[PDB]
């Protein structure tokens, strides 16, 4: 069941297996960087609808910060105009500036706050996160009008 | 001589006008530090070249 | 370059030279000065800068020679005025203060209303809810230059500053017009005592009286107004009151349950809570608190819910927090 | 401005190649061509004036045809990002107080607000000049750090001995005066009217009407009632007081100049006609040219404006909350209104089409 987990760039699909074997790796007694974290990099949903175990709290925020500056500050410097409308931009666009690991780990965290609906406050955070994983998948759904207006 | 000069040395220093401890009130760009002398009032006054 | 152009102007002076106070500027382009060491000499500027830039009785550029005035010396020791909170269309408006409207109309009708009559008001009652918040309210509602001064700030034991300090205030009041005249906490320059002699401070009255001389020296159609904020009613001249000029004594009292509720509804909601916390829940258990223990109930509630280790405060914490603070 | 066209460019560019201000008029033609393409990168004018300024066409020796072309591109590019770059080539090349500052000022409108604190950083140095004084008026637009202290510094800038700023400020005042005026110097313009200069008076007569144009008393109080006590001490005063008292009552004394409007957006229509009026409107004062430069402000001059509209959405009976003037029917007078009744999206100050709660529903 390790090989179906090999190809890890998915925005969704690889999620739960990286939740399942990881909680299975968490019930395996590994709460730190382990098989569990390798799943957490590759969980783009670990517990989104479900409640996260000690799995999310430790293993996300370990690379959830390793994700942070991975995507964030790539865009302070550039030769072209500011802003992009592409959902396929993880800030791995163009040359790779970002680990999809970090990305999809955050692209769990991106769903993790996709359910949260922290839109208005998270802006400047998500600006100081500057995660172009986040805000596209941070709201893919729910209400676009007022949620994203005070964005 | 260690002493001798050194001993002698102090005599120099043993001759002082004084060194006013003073209360710097502030400076300006003038490089005259604006200073209240402790008993006296303020005097905006140049500094030591090293300070 | 200009360095030396300026520096020569310095090279004039010689140095270090003497910070020293003026006594009397005299048109001879001499003037008599004042030394903390008390040589006091009738002596001349070195003129590029201006006598006008300074006042008789001010610390000025002086040589060590005769203490010849070298030129303009600050004497930055104070601000442009005595001790002031200088505000214009100030932060506090009648909305921000909770319902004070009882005496808001007092400050409204006196100051706000005529601006299209008496020259101002007397604040009394409690600070931090009534007086300070009212102070800026119509000052903001007239949107003029609000000058906040405490009698303790002004509590000048030097003879003539207290007036000059007030004059420095009146200096702003005239030029910075429209200027809201606010006067805080006069227990000291305002107690006329029993006498002009024998240990009673004239600079008390002399501050006030000239402050009053300048107070009684203006009345308006509603443009410039005055405010008197303090707890001592009778230590003050009736001419300081001068019924017909300040007929408004604004004496704050603990905000009544609804006016409380406004300060509550303001300051309850502005400290996080659980909807268990409610206004009439907090209204009722009160003794008629000041607008502060409104806040203070709400403030500590965070800390007591922080003592519960929660940012969303329970209804008990407020009830605790009030019955604490 | 609003009609922008290459033709008068194509008219005035060879005229600009002909480069004569007193004849071809090409100098301020560039300044007009600055008021043409505003806020857009025009590749033609970018090269056109590059084919004027750098080429130093025809008469240019004077700093005149130097600068008339400088700010000519300096208005147009605005907001294009990468495409604004050749505008400095006409501006920041030649050394003036307009020079090292505009190096990043061509970004100011192209940045569409800035992220760097560099604005107050370098500009302060040249400040610590008339249009260096102006440099910060752009800083207040996009950056929060350079918005504030200007208020009581304006007339204090006016208070500086040199007319360079003392002409600058009363001209720089009017736009600010109807936005954030200097209330005391209004009386000090009076005191300094004749003080070291009677042209200060001429301006202290004239520029009081400027600041007093469409705004009257209130924030402007100490300025204008002197124009009532200004009548004639001189026929030129009587002329400029007639300038003033006309400008005092300009727009029946009810108008406002606010480049920004309540929609959370800037306007470079006005901003195009600002610095053109700075090199122009020079009749009472320095940089003098000719009378007719007065009215270039007419691109940006606004009356104080609230258009209340009902579910018709175009002028119809409907009313905001209380005005001065009344409950505002369409095109009745007021400004900056957060009123009771609801708009269609994002209720704000300003022009609002009013919609009403169905229970109490009303045209108002």
From Swiss-Prot, chain A:
Residues 72-93 are annotated as: Disordered. The modification Phosphoserine is found at residues 80, 89. Transmembrane segments: none annotated. Residues 81-93 have a biased composition (Low complexity). Belongs to the proteasome subunit S2 family. Acts as a regulatory subunit of the 26S proteasome which is involved in the ATP-dependent degradation of ubiquitinated proteins. Present with 306000 molecules/cell in log phase SD medium. This is 26S proteasome regulatory subunit RPN1. It comes from Saccharomyces cerevisiae (strain ATCC 204508 / S288c). The gene is RPN1. The chain holds residues 99 to 249 of 993 of the full protein.
From Swiss-Prot, chain B:
It is found in: Cytoplasm; Nucleus. Signal peptide: none annotated. N-acetylated by NAT1. May form a homodimer or a heterodimer with a related family member. Interacts with OLA1, TMA17, and UBR1. Present with 4700 molecules/cell in log phase SD medium. The 26S proteasome is involved in the ATP-dependent degradation of ubiquitinated proteins. The regulatory (or ATPase) complex confers ATP dependency and substrate specificity to the 26S complex. Belongs to the AAA ATPase family. This is 26S proteasome regulatory subunit 8 homolog. The chain holds residues 52 to 102 of 405 of the full protein.
Curated annotation (Swiss-Prot), chain C:
GO terms for molecular function: ATP binding; ATP hydrolysis activity; proteasome-activating activity. Changing residue 131 to Q: 73% loss of ATPase activity. Keywords: ATP-binding, Cytoplasm, Isopeptide bond, Lipoprotein, Myristate, Nucleotide-binding, Nucleus, Proteasome, Ubl conjugation. There is a cross-link at residues 136, 157, 192 (Glycyl lysine isopeptide (Lys-Gly) (interchain with G-Cter in ubiquitin)). It comes from the Eukaryota. GO terms for biological process: nonfunctional rRNA decay; peptide catabolic process; positive regulation of protein catabolic process; proteasome regulatory particle assembly; proteasome-mediated ubiquitin-dependent protein catabolic process; protein-containing complex localization; ubiquitin-dependent protein catabolic process. GO terms for cellular component: cytoplasm; nucleus; proteasome complex; proteasome regulatory particle, base subcomplex. ATP binds at residues 125-132. It is found in: Cytoplasm; Nucleus. The 26S proteasome is involved in the ATP-dependent degradation of ubiquitinated proteins. The regulatory (or ATPase) complex confers ATP dependency and substrate specificity to the 26S complex. Has ATPase activity. Belongs to the AAA ATPase family. This is 26S proteasome regulatory subunit 4 homolog. The gene is RPT2. The chain holds residues 88 to 423 of 437 of the full protein.
């Amino acid at each position: 069941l390790c090989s179906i987990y090999d190809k890890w760039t998915d925005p969704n699909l690889k999620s739960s297996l990286a939740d399942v074997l990881s909680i299975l790796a968490m019930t395996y007694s590994e709460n730190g960087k382990h098989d569990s974290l390798r799943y957490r990099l590759l969980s783009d949903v670990s517990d989104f609808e479900g409640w996260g175990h000690e799995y999310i709290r430790h293993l996300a925020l370990e690379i959830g910060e390793v994700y942070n500056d991975q995507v964030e500050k790539d865009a302070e410097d550039e030769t072209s105009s500011d802003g992009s409308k592409s959902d396929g931009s993880a800030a791995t666009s163009g040359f790779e500036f970002s680990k999809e690991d970090t990305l999809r780990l955050c692209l769990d965290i991106v769903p993790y706050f996709l359910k949260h609906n922290g839109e208005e406050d998270a802006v400047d955070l998500l600006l100081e996160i500057e995660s172009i994983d986040k805000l596209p998948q941070f709201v893919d759904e729910n209400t676009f009008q007022r949620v994203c207006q005070y964005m | 001589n260690d002493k001798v000069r050194f001993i002698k040395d102090e005599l120099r220093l043993l001759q002082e006008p004084g060194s006013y401890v003073g209360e710097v009130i502030k400076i300006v760009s003038d490089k005259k530090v604006l200073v209240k002398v402790q008993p006296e009032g303020k005097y905006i006054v140049d500094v030591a070249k090293d300070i | 370059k200009q360095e030396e152009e300026k520096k020569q102007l310095e090279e004039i002076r010689g140095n270090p030279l003497s910070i020293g106070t003026l006594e009397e500027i005299i048109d001879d382009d001499h003037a008599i000065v004042t030394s903390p060491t008390m040589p006091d000499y009738y002596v001349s500027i070195l003129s590029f800068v201006d006598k006008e830039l300074l006042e008789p009785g001010c610390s000025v550029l002086l040589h060590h020679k005769t203490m010849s005035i070298v030129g303009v010396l600050q004497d930055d020791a104070d601000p442009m005025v005595s001790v002031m909170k200088m505000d214009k269309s100030p932060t506090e408006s009648y909305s921000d203060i909770g319902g004070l409207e009882s005496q808001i109309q007092e400050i409204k009708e006196s100051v706000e209303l005529p601006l299209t009559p008496p020259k101002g008001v007397i604040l009394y009652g409690a600070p931090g809810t009534g007086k300070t918040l009212l102070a800026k309210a119509v000052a903001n509602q007239t949107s003029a230059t609000f000058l906040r001064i405490v009698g303790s700030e002004l509590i000048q034991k030097y003879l003539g500053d207290g007036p000059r300090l007030c004059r420095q205030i009146f200096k702003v009041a005239g030029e910075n017009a429209p200027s809201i005249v606010f006067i805080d906490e006069i227990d000291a320059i305002g107690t006329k005592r029993y006498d002009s002699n024998s240990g009673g401070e004239r600079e008390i009255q002399r501050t006030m009286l000239e402050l009053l001389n300048q107070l009684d020296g203006f009345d308006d159609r509603g443009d410039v107004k005055v405010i008197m904020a303090t707890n001592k009613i009778e230590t003050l001249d009736p001419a300081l009151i001068r019924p017909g000029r300040i007929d408004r004594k604004i004496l704050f009292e603990n905000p009544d349950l609804s006016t409380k509720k406004k300060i509550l509804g303001i300051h309850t909601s502005k400290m996080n809570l659980s909807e268990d916390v409610n206004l009439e829940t907090l209204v009722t258990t009160k003794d008629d608190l000041s607008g502060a223990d409104i806040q203070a109930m709400c403030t500590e509630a965070g800390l007591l819910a922080l003592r519960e280790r929660r940012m969303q405060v329970t209804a008990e914490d407020f009830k605790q927090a009030k019955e604490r603070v | 401005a609003g009609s922008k066209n290459d033709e008068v460019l194509g008219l005035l560019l060879p005229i600009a190649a002909s480069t004569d201000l007193p004849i071809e008029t090409a100098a301020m033609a560039s300044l007009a061509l600055a008021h043409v393409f505003v806020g857009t990168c025009n590749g033609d004018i970018t090269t056109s004036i590059m084919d004027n300024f750098l080429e130093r066409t025809a008469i240019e020796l004077k700093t005149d045809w130097v600068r008339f072309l400088a700010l000519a591109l300096g208005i147009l590019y605005m907001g294009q990002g990468e495409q604004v770059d050749d505008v400095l080539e006409t501006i920041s090349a030649i050394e003036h107080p307009m020079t090292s500052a505009i190096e990043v000022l061509v970004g100011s409108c192209a940045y569409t607000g800035t992220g760097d604190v560099l604005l107050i950083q370098d500009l302060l140095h040249r400040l610590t000049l008339a249009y260096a004084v102006l440099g910060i008026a752009l800083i207040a637009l996009g950056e929060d750090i350079g918005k504030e202290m200007s208020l009581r510094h304006f007339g204090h800038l006016m208070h500086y001995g040199n007319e360079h700023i003392r002409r600058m400020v009363p001209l720089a005042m009017g736009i600010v005066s109807v936005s954030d005026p200097q209330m005391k110097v209004f009386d000090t313009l009076t005191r300094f009217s004749h003080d070291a200069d009677l042209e200060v008076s001429m301006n202290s007569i004239f520029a009081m009407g400027l600041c007093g144009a469409g705004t009257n008393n209130a924030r402007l109080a100490q300025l204008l009632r002197q124009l009532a006590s200004y009548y004639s001490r001189e026929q030129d005063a009587l002329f400029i007081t007639r300038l003033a008292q006309g400008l005092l009552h300009l727009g029946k004394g009810t108008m406002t100049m606010d480049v920004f409007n309540d929609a959370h957006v800037l306007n470079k229509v006005t901003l195009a006609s600002i610095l053109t009026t700075a090199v122009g409107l020079v009749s009472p004062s320095f940089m003098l040219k000719h009378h007719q430069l007065f009215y270039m402000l007419n691109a940006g001059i606004r009356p104080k404006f609230i258009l209340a509209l009902n579910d018709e959405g175009e002028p119809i009976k409907v009313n905001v909350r209380v005005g001065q003037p009344v409950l505002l029917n369409h095109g009745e007078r007021a400004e900056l209104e957060t009123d009771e009744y609801i708009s269609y999206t994002s209720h704000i100050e300003g022009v609002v089409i009013l919609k009403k709660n169905p229970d109490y529903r009303e045209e108002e």
